Design a protein around this nucleic acid. Structure first.
Ligand SMILES: [Ca+2]
Ligand SMILES: [Ca+2]
Length: 327
DNA sequence: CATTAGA
DNA sequence: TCTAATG
Protein backbone atom coordinates (compact mmCIF):
# COMPACT_ATOMS: atom_id res chain seq x y z
CA UNK A 1 0.00 0.00 0.00
CA UNK A 2 2.91 2.27 0.42
CA UNK A 3 6.14 0.52 1.17
CA UNK A 4 5.72 -0.91 -2.24
CA UNK A 5 4.41 2.22 -3.86
CA UNK A 6 7.08 3.41 -6.32
CA UNK A 7 7.38 -0.02 -7.66
CA UNK A 8 3.81 -0.34 -8.47
CA UNK A 9 2.98 2.98 -9.82
CA UNK A 10 6.02 2.73 -12.11
CA UNK A 11 4.90 -0.77 -13.20
CA UNK A 12 1.37 0.48 -14.06
CA UNK A 13 2.81 3.32 -15.90
CA UNK A 14 4.77 0.57 -17.52
CA UNK A 15 1.72 -1.52 -18.24
CA UNK A 16 -0.69 1.22 -19.30
CA UNK A 17 1.78 2.47 -21.90
CA UNK A 18 2.10 -1.05 -23.57
CA UNK A 19 -1.51 -1.56 -24.06
CA UNK A 20 -2.06 2.17 -24.96
CA UNK A 21 0.54 3.45 -27.32
CA UNK A 22 1.61 0.02 -28.47
CA UNK A 23 -0.48 -2.91 -29.03
CA UNK A 24 1.33 -5.03 -26.31
CA UNK A 25 -1.64 -6.82 -24.66
CA UNK A 26 0.70 -9.37 -23.06
CA UNK A 27 3.50 -7.05 -21.83
CA UNK A 28 0.65 -5.10 -20.62
CA UNK A 29 -0.88 -8.14 -19.04
CA UNK A 30 2.66 -8.91 -17.84
CA UNK A 31 3.16 -5.61 -16.10
CA UNK A 32 -0.12 -5.61 -14.23
CA UNK A 33 0.17 -9.06 -12.55
CA UNK A 34 3.63 -7.90 -11.36
CA UNK A 35 2.56 -4.61 -9.80
CA UNK A 36 -0.09 -6.99 -8.52
CA UNK A 37 2.23 -9.44 -6.89
CA UNK A 38 4.72 -6.81 -6.07
CA UNK A 39 1.87 -4.90 -4.26
CA UNK A 40 0.93 -7.71 -2.00
CA UNK A 41 4.48 -8.38 -0.70
CA UNK A 42 4.63 -7.39 2.90
CA UNK A 43 8.25 -6.15 2.96
CA UNK A 44 10.37 -3.64 1.13
CA UNK A 45 11.88 -4.47 -2.16
CA UNK A 46 15.60 -3.87 -1.90
CA UNK A 47 16.56 -5.27 -5.11
CA UNK A 48 15.30 -6.74 -8.29
CA UNK A 49 16.64 -10.12 -7.39
CA UNK A 50 14.60 -9.85 -4.33
CA UNK A 51 11.45 -9.04 -6.37
CA UNK A 52 12.39 -11.58 -8.96
CA UNK A 53 11.67 -14.21 -6.46
CA UNK A 54 8.15 -13.38 -7.24
CA UNK A 55 5.64 -14.97 -9.41
CA UNK A 56 5.29 -13.08 -12.69
CA UNK A 57 8.47 -11.34 -12.01
CA UNK A 58 11.30 -11.75 -14.30
CA UNK A 59 14.54 -10.57 -15.61
CA UNK A 60 12.51 -8.16 -17.66
CA UNK A 61 10.83 -6.21 -14.83
CA UNK A 62 13.43 -6.94 -12.15
CA UNK A 63 15.90 -5.10 -14.25
CA UNK A 64 13.47 -2.37 -14.28
CA UNK A 65 13.03 -2.49 -10.46
CA UNK A 66 16.76 -2.15 -9.76
CA UNK A 67 17.15 0.89 -11.93
CA UNK A 68 13.97 2.46 -10.30
CA UNK A 69 15.41 1.58 -7.07
CA UNK A 70 19.00 2.65 -7.73
CA UNK A 71 18.10 6.10 -9.20
CA UNK A 72 14.88 7.97 -8.50
CA UNK A 73 13.74 7.19 -12.02
CA UNK A 74 13.62 5.10 -15.08
CA UNK A 75 14.50 6.24 -18.63
CA UNK A 76 11.99 4.05 -20.46
CA UNK A 77 9.70 5.60 -18.12
CA UNK A 78 11.20 9.08 -18.90
CA UNK A 79 11.20 8.81 -22.73
CA UNK A 80 7.53 7.92 -22.93
CA UNK A 81 6.57 10.66 -20.68
CA UNK A 82 8.49 12.81 -23.15
CA UNK A 83 7.15 10.86 -26.37
CA UNK A 84 5.00 13.15 -28.42
CA UNK A 85 3.05 10.60 -30.26
CA UNK A 86 2.59 8.54 -27.23
CA UNK A 87 1.39 11.53 -25.26
CA UNK A 88 -0.84 12.16 -28.14
CA UNK A 89 -2.63 8.93 -27.74
CA UNK A 90 -3.03 9.24 -24.02
CA UNK A 91 -4.57 12.64 -24.76
CA UNK A 92 -6.96 11.96 -27.65
CA UNK A 93 -8.32 9.05 -25.79
CA UNK A 94 -9.80 11.60 -23.22
CA UNK A 95 -12.36 12.13 -25.84
CA UNK A 96 -15.63 10.50 -25.33
CA UNK A 97 -15.52 7.67 -27.83
CA UNK A 98 -11.90 7.65 -28.58
CA UNK A 99 -10.01 4.66 -27.73
CA UNK A 100 -6.57 3.17 -28.17
CA UNK A 101 -7.62 1.90 -31.62
CA UNK A 102 -9.02 5.16 -32.78
CA UNK A 103 -6.40 7.03 -30.86
CA UNK A 104 -3.46 5.75 -32.73
CA UNK A 105 -5.42 5.54 -35.96
CA UNK A 106 -6.07 9.32 -35.62
CA UNK A 107 -2.51 10.00 -34.81
CA UNK A 108 -0.96 8.35 -37.74
CA UNK A 109 -3.29 10.45 -39.75
CA UNK A 110 -1.82 13.78 -38.37
CA UNK A 111 -4.62 14.63 -35.85
CA UNK A 112 -2.74 15.28 -32.62
CA UNK A 113 -4.74 17.97 -30.95
CA UNK A 114 -8.05 18.95 -29.65
CA UNK A 115 -8.00 21.35 -32.55
CA UNK A 116 -6.93 18.70 -34.98
CA UNK A 117 -10.04 16.93 -33.96
CA UNK A 118 -12.18 19.81 -34.91
CA UNK A 119 -10.89 20.49 -38.41
CA UNK A 120 -11.98 16.98 -39.15
CA UNK A 121 -15.18 16.44 -37.36
CA UNK A 122 -15.97 14.44 -40.44
CA UNK A 123 -13.43 11.80 -39.54
CA UNK A 124 -15.19 11.34 -36.22
CA UNK A 125 -18.46 9.54 -35.35
CA UNK A 126 -21.66 10.75 -33.65
CA UNK A 127 -20.44 9.46 -30.32
CA UNK A 128 -16.99 11.25 -30.79
CA UNK A 129 -18.52 14.39 -32.35
CA UNK A 130 -20.67 14.80 -29.22
CA UNK A 131 -17.77 13.88 -27.19
CA UNK A 132 -16.08 16.63 -28.96
CA UNK A 133 -18.69 19.08 -28.12
CA UNK A 134 -18.73 18.32 -24.42
CA UNK A 135 -15.06 17.57 -23.83
CA UNK A 136 -14.85 20.32 -21.20
CA UNK A 137 -18.25 19.50 -19.73
CA UNK A 138 -17.50 15.82 -19.58
CA UNK A 139 -14.43 16.17 -17.66
CA UNK A 140 -16.09 18.17 -14.98
CA UNK A 141 -17.26 16.95 -11.69
CA UNK A 142 -20.90 17.09 -10.73
CA UNK A 143 -21.85 18.76 -7.47
CA UNK A 144 -24.28 16.69 -5.40
CA UNK A 145 -26.19 19.99 -5.13
CA UNK A 146 -26.92 19.32 -8.84
CA UNK A 147 -27.21 15.50 -8.29
CA UNK A 148 -30.41 16.34 -6.39
CA UNK A 149 -31.60 18.74 -9.09
CA UNK A 150 -30.92 16.17 -11.65
CA UNK A 151 -32.30 13.41 -9.55
CA UNK A 152 -35.51 15.31 -8.92
CA UNK A 153 -36.44 16.00 -12.44
CA UNK A 154 -35.78 12.51 -13.53
CA UNK A 155 -37.72 10.97 -10.80
CA UNK A 156 -40.20 13.53 -11.90
CA UNK A 157 -41.01 12.44 -15.37
CA UNK A 158 -40.39 8.73 -14.60
CA UNK A 159 -43.50 9.16 -12.55
CA UNK A 160 -45.59 11.22 -14.91
CA UNK A 161 -45.19 8.79 -17.80
CA UNK A 162 -46.08 5.84 -15.69
CA UNK A 163 -46.69 5.91 -11.99
CA UNK A 164 -45.68 2.21 -11.96
CA UNK A 165 -42.00 2.86 -12.73
CA UNK A 166 -39.06 2.62 -10.30
CA UNK A 167 -35.81 4.36 -10.61
CA UNK A 168 -32.88 4.65 -8.42
CA UNK A 169 -30.00 6.86 -8.93
CA UNK A 170 -27.24 4.63 -7.87
CA UNK A 171 -23.52 5.02 -7.78
CA UNK A 172 -21.46 7.13 -5.43
CA UNK A 173 -24.09 9.80 -5.44
CA UNK A 174 -26.42 7.30 -4.02
CA UNK A 175 -23.80 6.58 -1.42
CA UNK A 176 -23.93 10.32 -0.29
CA UNK A 177 -20.74 11.35 -2.21
CA UNK A 178 -20.07 15.16 -2.43
CA UNK A 179 -19.59 14.94 -6.21
CA UNK A 180 -20.04 12.60 -8.97
CA UNK A 181 -18.80 12.15 -12.51
CA UNK A 182 -21.91 10.72 -14.24
CA UNK A 183 -25.40 10.23 -13.03
CA UNK A 184 -26.36 6.54 -12.85
CA UNK A 185 -30.09 5.80 -13.17
CA UNK A 186 -31.32 2.22 -12.75
CA UNK A 187 -34.81 1.40 -13.89
CA UNK A 188 -37.47 -1.28 -13.80
CA UNK A 189 -41.09 -2.11 -14.10
CA UNK A 190 -43.36 -4.87 -12.91
CA UNK A 191 -44.42 -5.46 -16.36
CA UNK A 192 -40.64 -6.32 -17.15
CA UNK A 193 -38.66 -9.02 -15.48
CA UNK A 194 -37.17 -12.48 -16.04
CA UNK A 195 -39.15 -14.13 -18.84
CA UNK A 196 -41.76 -11.35 -19.82
CA UNK A 197 -40.37 -10.80 -23.21
CA UNK A 198 -39.48 -7.25 -22.93
CA UNK A 199 -41.19 -4.10 -23.62
CA UNK A 200 -38.41 -2.02 -25.05
CA UNK A 201 -40.86 0.77 -25.02
CA UNK A 202 -40.53 0.54 -21.33
CA UNK A 203 -37.19 2.12 -21.80
CA UNK A 204 -38.00 4.30 -24.79
CA UNK A 205 -40.98 6.00 -23.21
CA UNK A 206 -38.91 7.65 -20.52
CA UNK A 207 -36.09 8.76 -22.80
CA UNK A 208 -38.74 10.49 -24.83
CA UNK A 209 -40.24 12.12 -21.83
CA UNK A 210 -36.92 13.35 -20.59
CA UNK A 211 -35.94 14.96 -23.92
CA UNK A 212 -39.46 16.12 -24.09
CA UNK A 213 -38.97 18.32 -21.25
CA UNK A 214 -35.42 19.16 -22.16
CA UNK A 215 -33.59 16.93 -19.78
CA UNK A 216 -32.16 14.90 -22.58
CA UNK A 217 -30.13 16.62 -25.15
CA UNK A 218 -28.32 14.12 -27.22
CA UNK A 219 -28.08 10.46 -27.61
CA UNK A 220 -24.68 8.68 -27.55
CA UNK A 221 -26.44 5.40 -27.74
CA UNK A 222 -29.87 4.05 -27.48
CA UNK A 223 -30.76 0.45 -26.97
CA UNK A 224 -33.90 -1.28 -25.77
CA UNK A 225 -32.31 -1.63 -22.24
CA UNK A 226 -29.47 0.68 -22.24
CA UNK A 227 -29.76 4.25 -23.08
CA UNK A 228 -26.44 6.23 -22.92
CA UNK A 229 -26.69 10.04 -23.15
CA UNK A 230 -26.16 13.81 -22.29
CA UNK A 231 -28.47 15.86 -19.97
CA UNK A 232 -28.70 19.37 -18.61
CA UNK A 233 -30.23 21.45 -15.88
CA UNK A 234 -32.42 24.22 -17.28
CA UNK A 235 -30.20 27.16 -17.34
CA UNK A 236 -32.00 29.47 -14.90
CA UNK A 237 -33.21 33.06 -15.06
CA UNK A 238 -29.99 33.81 -16.92
CA UNK A 239 -26.32 34.50 -16.32
CA UNK A 240 -25.97 30.83 -15.45
CA UNK A 241 -26.35 27.84 -17.71
CA UNK A 242 -25.44 24.37 -16.81
CA UNK A 243 -22.55 22.37 -18.26
CA UNK A 244 -23.68 19.35 -20.32
CA UNK A 245 -23.66 16.13 -18.19
CA UNK A 246 -23.24 12.43 -19.10
CA UNK A 247 -26.17 10.26 -18.31
CA UNK A 248 -27.16 6.67 -18.49
CA UNK A 249 -30.44 5.04 -17.78
CA UNK A 250 -30.96 1.23 -17.96
CA UNK A 251 -33.90 -1.13 -18.25
CA UNK A 252 -34.38 -4.00 -15.88
CA UNK A 253 -36.47 -7.03 -14.95
CA UNK A 254 -38.23 -6.04 -11.67
CA UNK A 255 -37.37 -9.54 -10.68
CA UNK A 256 -33.70 -8.35 -10.68
CA UNK A 257 -33.51 -4.80 -9.11
CA UNK A 258 -32.27 -4.92 -5.49
CA UNK A 259 -29.09 -6.79 -6.35
CA UNK A 260 -28.67 -4.83 -9.43
CA UNK A 261 -29.29 -1.85 -7.34
CA UNK A 262 -27.18 -3.13 -4.48
CA UNK A 263 -24.34 -3.80 -6.77
CA UNK A 264 -24.02 -0.54 -8.81
CA UNK A 265 -24.34 1.16 -5.42
CA UNK A 266 -20.97 -0.28 -4.35
CA UNK A 267 -18.44 0.75 -3.17
CA UNK A 268 -16.34 -1.60 -5.26
CA UNK A 269 -15.09 -2.89 -1.95
CA UNK A 270 -18.36 -2.97 0.05
CA UNK A 271 -19.59 -5.32 -2.50
CA UNK A 272 -16.61 -7.61 -2.87
CA UNK A 273 -16.61 -7.62 0.87
CA UNK A 274 -20.35 -8.38 1.30
CA UNK A 275 -20.07 -10.82 -1.47
CA UNK A 276 -17.16 -12.61 0.14
CA UNK A 277 -19.47 -13.13 3.14
CA UNK A 278 -22.34 -14.47 1.10
CA UNK A 279 -19.80 -17.32 0.39
CA UNK A 280 -19.55 -18.21 3.99
CA UNK A 281 -23.22 -17.43 4.47
CA UNK A 282 -23.75 -20.29 1.97
CA UNK A 283 -24.55 -17.94 -0.82
CA UNK A 284 -23.70 -16.29 -4.01
CA UNK A 285 -24.29 -12.80 -5.04
CA UNK A 286 -23.75 -11.39 -8.56
CA UNK A 287 -25.01 -8.38 -10.42
CA UNK A 288 -28.42 -10.02 -10.84
CA UNK A 289 -29.06 -12.64 -8.31
CA UNK A 290 -28.55 -14.42 -5.15
CA UNK A 291 -28.23 -18.13 -5.21
CA UNK A 292 -27.61 -20.64 -2.43
CA UNK A 293 -24.65 -22.91 -2.57
CA UNK A 294 -24.82 -26.63 -2.81
CA UNK A 295 -21.97 -28.40 -1.10
CA UNK A 296 -21.40 -30.45 -4.39
CA UNK A 297 -19.12 -27.64 -5.44
CA UNK A 298 -21.63 -25.05 -6.63
CA UNK A 299 -25.27 -24.54 -6.96
CA UNK A 300 -28.16 -22.54 -8.46
CA UNK A 301 -31.68 -21.46 -7.47
CA UNK A 302 -32.26 -17.69 -7.35
CA UNK A 303 -33.53 -16.56 -4.02
CA UNK A 304 -36.36 -14.12 -4.29
CA UNK A 305 -35.65 -10.34 -3.71
CA UNK A 306 -38.10 -7.37 -3.00
CA UNK A 307 -35.40 -5.26 -1.39
CA UNK A 308 -31.90 -4.55 -0.28
CA UNK A 309 -33.20 -6.01 2.87
CA UNK A 310 -33.79 -9.62 1.66
CA UNK A 311 -30.33 -9.75 0.36
CA UNK A 312 -29.15 -8.61 3.81
CA UNK A 313 -31.49 -11.06 5.68
CA UNK A 314 -30.39 -13.83 3.56
CA UNK A 315 -26.66 -13.65 4.39
CA UNK A 316 -27.49 -12.56 7.94
CA UNK A 317 -25.82 -9.16 8.13
CA UNK A 318 -26.60 -5.70 9.23
CA UNK A 319 -28.49 -3.70 6.69
CA UNK A 320 -26.04 -1.04 5.69
CA UNK A 321 -27.59 2.36 4.94
CA UNK A 322 -26.10 3.14 1.55
CA UNK A 323 -24.22 6.09 3.21
CA UNK A 324 -22.15 3.57 4.92
CA UNK A 325 -21.56 1.00 2.23
CA UNK A 326 -18.30 2.55 1.67
CA UNK A 327 -16.46 -0.70 2.66
C1' DC B 1 -18.82 -8.54 -18.99
C1' DA B 2 -22.75 -7.01 -21.68
C1' DT B 3 -24.33 -3.62 -24.49
C1' DT B 4 -24.38 -0.64 -28.68
C1' DA B 5 -22.51 1.37 -33.32
C1' DG B 6 -20.69 0.54 -37.13
C1' DA B 7 -18.82 -0.70 -41.32
C1' DT C 1 -19.59 -10.46 -38.85
C1' DC C 2 -16.53 -8.72 -36.16
C1' DT C 3 -14.47 -5.09 -33.63
C1' DA C 4 -14.27 -0.89 -30.66
C1' DA C 5 -15.75 1.66 -27.04
C1' DT C 6 -18.46 2.68 -22.24
C1' DG C 7 -19.56 1.23 -18.11
CA1 LIG D 1 9.78 -15.56 -10.57
CA1 LIG E 1 -11.79 7.87 -24.17
Amino acid sequence: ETLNGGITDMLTELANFEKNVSQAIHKYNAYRKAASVIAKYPHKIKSGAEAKKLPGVGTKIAEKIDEFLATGKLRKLEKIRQDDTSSSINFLTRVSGIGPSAARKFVDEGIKTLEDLRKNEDKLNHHQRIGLKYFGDFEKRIPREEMLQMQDIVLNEVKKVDSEYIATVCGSFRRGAESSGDMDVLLTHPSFTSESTKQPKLLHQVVEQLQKVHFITDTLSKGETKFMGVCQLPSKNDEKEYPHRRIDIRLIPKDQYYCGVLYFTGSDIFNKNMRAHALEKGFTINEYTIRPLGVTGVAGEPLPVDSEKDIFDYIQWKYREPKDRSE
